[PDB]
Amino acid sequence: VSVNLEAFSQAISAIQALRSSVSRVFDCLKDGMRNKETLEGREKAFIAHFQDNLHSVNRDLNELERLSNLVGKLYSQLLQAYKWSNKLQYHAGLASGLLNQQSLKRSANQMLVLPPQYVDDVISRIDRMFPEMSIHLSRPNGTSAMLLVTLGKVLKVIVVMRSLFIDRTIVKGYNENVYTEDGKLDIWSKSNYQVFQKVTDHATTALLHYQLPQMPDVVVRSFMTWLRSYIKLFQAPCQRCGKFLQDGLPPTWRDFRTLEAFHDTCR
Amino acid sequence: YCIDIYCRSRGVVAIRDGAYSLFDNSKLVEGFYPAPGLKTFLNMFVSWAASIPTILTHSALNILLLPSPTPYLCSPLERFLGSVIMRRHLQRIIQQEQLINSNEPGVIMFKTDALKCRVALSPKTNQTLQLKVPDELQVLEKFFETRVAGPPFKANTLIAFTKLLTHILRDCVHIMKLELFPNVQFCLTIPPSAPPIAPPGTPAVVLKSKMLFFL
Amino acid sequence: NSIHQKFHISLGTVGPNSGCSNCHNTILHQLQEMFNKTPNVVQLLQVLF
Amino acid sequence: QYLCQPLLDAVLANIRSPVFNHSLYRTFVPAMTAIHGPPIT
Amino acid sequence: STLVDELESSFEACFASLVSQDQEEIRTGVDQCIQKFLDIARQTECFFLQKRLQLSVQKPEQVIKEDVSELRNELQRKDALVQKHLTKLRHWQQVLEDI
Amino acid sequence: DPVQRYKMLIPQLKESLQTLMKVAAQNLIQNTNIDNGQKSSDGPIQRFDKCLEEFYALCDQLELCLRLAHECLSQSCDSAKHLPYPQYLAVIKAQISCAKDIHTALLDCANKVTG
Amino acid sequence: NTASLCRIGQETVQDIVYRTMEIFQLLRNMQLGTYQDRLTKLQDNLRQLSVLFRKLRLVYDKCNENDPIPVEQLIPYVESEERREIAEVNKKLKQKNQQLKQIMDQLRNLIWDINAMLAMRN
Ligand SMILES: [Zn+2]
């Protein structure tokens, strides 16, 4: 356990700060006087500093017991070869660096085929968690995969891929026939809802926002992570206007890199 | 055991005893048993009088604190502790249960049978103690110097060697001369000597630490 | 640092000439305490020297 | 704030005294300079 | 003058964070090397902006040499594809009479 | 063992500071009365330097309860991080070979750069 | 010609800069038999890095061999038969662009024919 082993740090610092502060109380009163020209700038500062250091000792004493309340509670030769592997984890963090994703790219101008089973292995990696959502991969038309996604009791989404990249994505509710009369997945239709049609535009702006020229897996992973915030729809008020409805519209627009529900007017 | 270091300008360091008390000679520290003889080990670089902070010019602390080959790459400081920590606790071995009989300033004589030995601090290198006790006797202390007083310096290996120490010495030294020519297992003369095979060895397991004999 | 009303002196290795780390941080909580007393840069510089 | 009134009462009793800086010195100086350490170089 | 040298001086400083024999030094060390290294690089651009604007205005011929150079290299790659396209055009010929 | 031994040091420490400041206040009046002109027999002088034996040692017996615990929460946890002993004997020498290989590869790249 | 060499020097500076970020991108992928491939990859990368370093030193000397005329002549103040070739080939390449434009327009008609085929195929 480490909650007590790190909560002890404040108390073990506070007792030494008590020793140092009472030493200050002793020697500052033992320092005598430093007039610095006028006496009224000293003798009125005498009671000021005498209150200051004594009250510092007092507040240190006081904050000692609120930390004390929250806390609770071959022989040494082979011990040395144990923690070095644990500090090798820090050594892994030694060469990380904070440069991360950001680079200094210029223009990319000078002077392919992948199996659908690779797409299936891609979709199997992230479907394994988030059990409230489901993924149903299908290719009734060509090698391109379009997927049915159910979101608890809320949303039914068709997500069309092509050429291993993104093609389209249309979201509807939970009580509609997303299939056709023949039973195939619907391709060209409309969600028949003002809020859903409004947020499909946000989805189209988001798919053109996540731009990786080589790595579309993180593009679609960030897309579905963004979509995961939309299971909180009709349940969270807007962050700037307080109320849900802006002209009758609840907040939906999650901002880029900061996922919280907004409107177009609410930015 | 404790160390005091007091830095100062122009490369000056004041070296106190640490384990002493500055102020009380009637009273000391409970957990830090006092550490004598420290200044002599300082003065070669150059009772309760080692409690002074000793001026050094930031340069003998180099050779003292540096891990150096043992005269394992163990420092003259930590070797000297090992010479000390054997010297403290061998006494605490000898006084209990065996026969204790010695008369010297700091040297200790264990008056048992089979060439009772007397051990003092070595003068050329104080970092190791030196024991004084036919020709196969002397190899035992060099093995004791290299291994039982090995620079890991843990206490319980002395428990075996103190309890380790007649004709049993004759075979084991033949095994000891053999082992020195090329551990946790000693030898005994159930037979007359130690041949190349079938010796009545005396081992000691780490997890057991019991009197082990194999024949 | 205004909400601290303090200074957060960072003891740090610079240049390709060192061993494992900066290693001045044993006295880290102690060097901060002394400059509570003093607004004098030489007090910091000379203790290092 | 709690159990500090001897320290508060000592300074008001010892105020308007000409031996103030020496009375406090006499009653206090050996306690901190002995155990906690010597003065600086 | 010798601007590559102080540029490549910051190169081994970029290795100072990497090669040796509590985090705050690392964030500073990887920063000020890089920010001076982008400092030492962007000025070479402006130095190169100086050097070929010198060549741009002091003479008009190296402008039109490189203008011909880019269009000839466009002239080939234009021609490189069209009879490639034509050979390709010949490809779906027999692809389509398979029925 | 030390989990219940810590539970008595801290409440003893709080009152150790209390009796420390109480004997300090006992010394304060007795020593201020000597300085100015007024007479009072010291009797039980109750000198403070003995009482300081009680508190700092209780701050030290705290650390003996913590630092040994700092050892006690470490040694048993990482004793068997990586049941068959010879497999472990093989993987420790393999990993200590590879760690030195990457350690000298870092210096190999550094020496390829300069030096 | 020398302006092309200065452009080459600028692009090789960009090459070393991109080389630096690609080294930092590649090395950050490994922390503590898969290890051998990454180290061989980085060895080839640093070999190409050294080759690029020496070739930028070569082209830096090549661009620095010729400069007497200084800067501040460069600020634009308000106060032979190759040109015939340029003028004649500009409209030829424009005519080629238009000639392929009618062809791709015919292909546009073809693709507007073909997208209605699958539209009502069923
Ligand atoms: Zn809103």
SS (H, E, C) B188-211: CCCCCCCCCCCCCEEECCCCCCCC
Contact with chain G for residue E62, Cβ under 8 A: yes
Locate tokens 């059990």: which residue? A131
DSSP SS3 for A185:
strand
Considering only CB atoms, which chain E residues are within 8 Å of A111? 73
Q: At what angle do helices A3-30 and A40-70 cross, to 10 degrees?
A: 160
Distance from CA of A73 to the nearest CA of F (A): 5
DSSP label at residue A242: S
Residues pairing with A149 in the sheet: A157
**Rounded distance between C-alpha atoms, residue A182 and residue A160, angstroms:** 19
Q: Report CB contact under 8 Å: E17, A98.
A: no
Opening angle at CA G10, ends G7 and G12, nearest 5: 110
Longest Cα pair distance anywhere in chain D, in angstroms? 37
The type of residue at B162 is T
**Rounded distance between C-alpha atoms, residue B169 and residue B186, angstroms:** 10
Tokens describing residue F50: 């003995």
The type of residue at A84 is W
Opening angle at CA F103, ends F99 and F108, nearest 5: 140
Residue of B nearest to F57 (CA): B30
Q: How far are the Cα atoms of C21, E17, E88, F114, G27 from residue C16, in angstroms, in the given order?
A: 11, 7, 58, 12, 19
Read off φ and ψ for residue B116, nearest 5 degrees.
-55, 130
**Rounded distance between C-alpha atoms, residue B172 and residue B188, angstroms:** 6
Contacts of G88 (CB under 8 A, 6+ apart): none
Contacts of C23 (CB under 8 A, 6+ apart): none
Task: Tell me how far apart the terminal alpha carbons of chain A are, to the nearest angstrom.
Answer: 44
DSSP SS3 for B54:
strand
Contact with chain E for residue C41, Cβ under 8 A: no
Contacts of A42 (CB under 8 A, 6+ apart): A33, A34, A35, A36
Residues 2-61 of B with CB under 8 A from F: 23, 27, 30-31
Q: Report CB contact under 8 Å: B152, A75.
A: no
- Nearest CB to E18; choose among A95, A99, A104: A95
Cβ atoms of E29 and C14 closer than 8 Å: yes
**Cα of A265 from ligand 1 centre, angstroms:** 7
Torsion of CA A10, A16, A20, A22, to 10 degrees: 90
**Nearest of A76, A241, C5 to residue F71 by alpha carbon:** A76
Locate tokens 């601090």: which residue? B121
Residues pairing with A137 in the sheet: A147
Task: Tell me how far apart the terminal alpha carbons of chain G are, to the nearest angstrom.
Answer: 62
- Nearest CB to E30; choose among A99, A104, A111: A99
Read off φ and ψ for residue E41, nearest 5 degrees.
-95, -45
Considering only CB atoms, which chain A residues are within 8 Å of E18? 95
Considering only CB atoms, which chain B residues are within 8 Å of A75? 154-156
Q: Report CB contact under 8 Å: B155, A75.
A: yes
Handedness of CA F96, F100, F103, F109 (dihedral sign): negative
**Rounded distance between C-alpha atoms, residue F30 and residue B12, angstroms:** 42
Instruction: Write the burial class of residue E20 (CB in 10 Å: 0-12 exposed, 13-18 middle, 19+ buried).
Output: middle
Tokens describing residue F96: 């200590």
Q: How far are the Cα atoms of B132, G98, G103, G105, G113 from residue G110, in angstroms, in the given order?
A: 110, 18, 11, 9, 5
Residues pairing with E48 in the sheet: none
> Which segments of A107-195 are extended strands (E)?
136-138, 146-151, 155-162, 165-172
**Rounded distance between C-alpha atoms, residue C40 and residue D2, angstroms:** 36
Cβ atoms of B99 and B112 closer than 8 Å: yes
Q: Report CB contact under 8 Å: D35, B23.
A: yes
Q: Are strands A165-172 and B6-8 parallel, antiparallel or unpaired?
A: unpaired
Cβ atoms of A115 and A145 closer than 8 Å: no
**Cα of A226 from ligand 1 centre, angstroms:** 18
Considering only CB atoms, which chain D residues are within 8 Å of B23? 34-35
Surrounding residues of ion ligand 1, Cβ less than 5 A:
A 238, 241, 246, 251, 263, 266
**Rounded distance between C-alpha atoms, residue B91 and residue E42, angstroms:** 75
The technique is cryo-EM
Instruction: Write the burial class of residue E44 (CB in 10 Å: 0-12 exposed, 13-18 middle, 19+ buried).
Output: middle
CA D14 to chain centre: 11
Tokens describing residue B167: 């004709």
Cβ atoms of A21 and D23 closer than 8 Å: no
**Rounded distance between C-alpha atoms, residue A206 and residue A200, angstroms:** 10
**Rounded distance between C-alpha atoms, residue E23 and residue C10, angstroms:** 10
Q: Report CB contact under 8 Å: B30, F64.
A: no
**Rounded distance between C-alpha atoms, residue A211 and residue A200, angstroms:** 18
**Rounded distance between C-alpha atoms, residue B4 and residue B51, angstroms:** 10
Contacts of A196 (CB under 8 A, 6+ apart): A171, A172, A173
Query: Containing H/E element for B56?
Result: strand B54-56
Cβ atoms of C19 and E21 closer than 8 Å: yes
Tokens describing residue B195: 């041949």
Residue A161, number of CB atoms within 10 A of its CB: 23
Contact with chain F for residue E12, Cβ under 8 A: yes
Tokens describing residue A4: 């007590």
- List the strands of the sheet with B129-132, edge to edge: B108-110, B117-121, B129-132
Radius of gyration of chain B (CA): 20
Contact with chain F for residue E15, Cβ under 8 A: yes
Cβ atoms of A157 and A130 closer than 8 Å: no
CA F30 to chain centre: 36
DSSP label at residue A26: H
Contacts of B186 (CB under 8 A, 6+ apart): B164, B172, B175, B201, B202, B203, B204
The type of residue at F7 is K
Query: Containing H/E element for F106?
Result: helix F85-113
Report the residue of A99, A110, A184, A215 to disrupt the G interface, i.e. the one with the largest count of G CBs within 10 Å. Answer: A99
Q: Are strands A155-162 and A165-172 parallel, antiparallel or unpaired?
A: antiparallel
Cβ atoms of F48 and F21 closer than 8 Å: no
**Rounded distance between C-alpha atoms, residue A63 and residue B37, angstroms:** 45
Contact with chain G for residue E67, Cβ under 8 A: yes
Helix H segments across chain D? 5-13, 20-35
**Nearest of A195, A158, A159 to residue A180 by alpha carbon:** A158
DSSP per-residue codes, A54-81: HHHHHHHHHHHHHHHHH-----SSGGGG
Q: How far are the Cα atoms of A136, B110, B153, F11 from residue B81, in angstroms, in the given order?
A: 71, 21, 9, 37
Per-residue exposure over A232-260, b if at least 16 CB sit within 10 Å of its own CB, e if not: ebeeeebeeeeebebeebbbbbbeeeeee
Q: How far are the Cα atoms of A135, A155, A228 from residue A127, in angstroms, in the given order?
A: 7, 16, 12
**Rounded distance between C-alpha atoms, residue A18 and residue F36, angstroms:** 31
**Rounded distance between C-alpha atoms, residue A256 and residue A265, angstroms:** 15
DSSP label at residue C42: H
Contact with chain F for residue E18, Cβ under 8 A: yes
**Rounded distance between C-alpha atoms, residue E27 and residue A9, angstroms:** 25
Chains B and A touch (3+ CB pairs under 8 A): yes
Longest Cα pair distance anywhere in chain C, in angstroms? 36
Cβ atoms of A261 and A238 closer than 8 Å: yes
Contacts of A147 (CB under 8 A, 6+ apart): A123, A135, A136, A137, A138, A158, A159, A160, A161
Residues 60-89 of G with CB under 8 A from A: none
Tokens describing residue A2: 């480490």
Tokens describing residue C44: 């910091």
Cβ atoms of B41 and B80 closer than 8 Å: yes
Cβ atoms of B68 and B76 closer than 8 Å: yes
Considering only CB atoms, which chain E residues are within 8 Å of F114? 12
Locate tokens 């009502």: which residue? G120
- Nearest CB to D6; choose among F28, F36, F48: F28
Contacts of D38 (CB under 8 A, 6+ apart): none
Opening angle at CA B131, ends B129 and B135, nearest 5: 140
* Three-class secondary structure assignment of B100-150: CCCCCCCCEEECCCCCCEEEEECCCCCCCEEEECCCCCHHHHHHHHHHHCC
Cβ atoms of D31 and A30 closer than 8 Å: no
- List the strands of the sheet with A136-138, edge to edge: A136-138, A146-151, A155-162, A165-172
Chains contacting C (3+ CB pairs below 8 angstroms)? E
Q: How far are the Cα atoms of E5, E8, G10, G70 from residue E46, in angstroms, in the given order?
A: 17, 18, 10, 14
* Three-class secondary structure assignment of chain F: CHHHHHHHHHHHHHHHHHHHHHHHHHHHHHHHHHHCCCCCCCCCCCCHHHHHHHHHHHHHHHHHHHHHHHHHHHHCCCCCCCCCHHHHHHHHHHHHHHHHHHHHHHHHHHHHHCC
DSSP SS3 for D32:
helix
Considering only CB atoms, which chain F residues are within 8 Å of G46? 109, 112
Longest Cα pair distance anywhere in chain G, in angstroms? 76
Q: Are strands B185-187 and B117-121 parallel, antiparallel or unpaired?
A: unpaired
Residues pairing with A150 in the sheet: A156
**Rounded distance between C-alpha atoms, residue A185 and residue A158, angstroms:** 8
DSSP label at residue B214: B
**Nearest of E11, E44, E9, E72 to residue G9 by alpha carbon:** E44
Q: How far are the Cα atoms of A220, B145, E91, G107 from residue G104, in angstroms, in the given order?
A: 34, 94, 18, 5
**Rounded distance between C-alpha atoms, residue E17 and residue E23, angstroms:** 11
Cβ atoms of B74 and B39 closer than 8 Å: no
Residues pairing with B117 in the sheet: B110
Opening angle at CA A70, ends F21 and A20, nearest 5: 35
- List the strands of the sheet with B54-56, edge to edge: B6-8, B12-15, B54-56
Q: Report CB contact under 8 Å: F81, A85.
A: yes
Q: Are strands B12-15 and B54-56 parallel, antiparallel or unpaired?
A: antiparallel
Chains contacting B (3+ CB pairs below 8 angstroms)? A, D, F
Contacts of B201 (CB under 8 A, 6+ apart): B175, B185, B186, B187, B188, B213, B214, B215
Report the residue of A91, A100, A104, A105 to disrupt the E interface, i.e. the one with the largest count of E CBs within 10 Å. Answer: A104
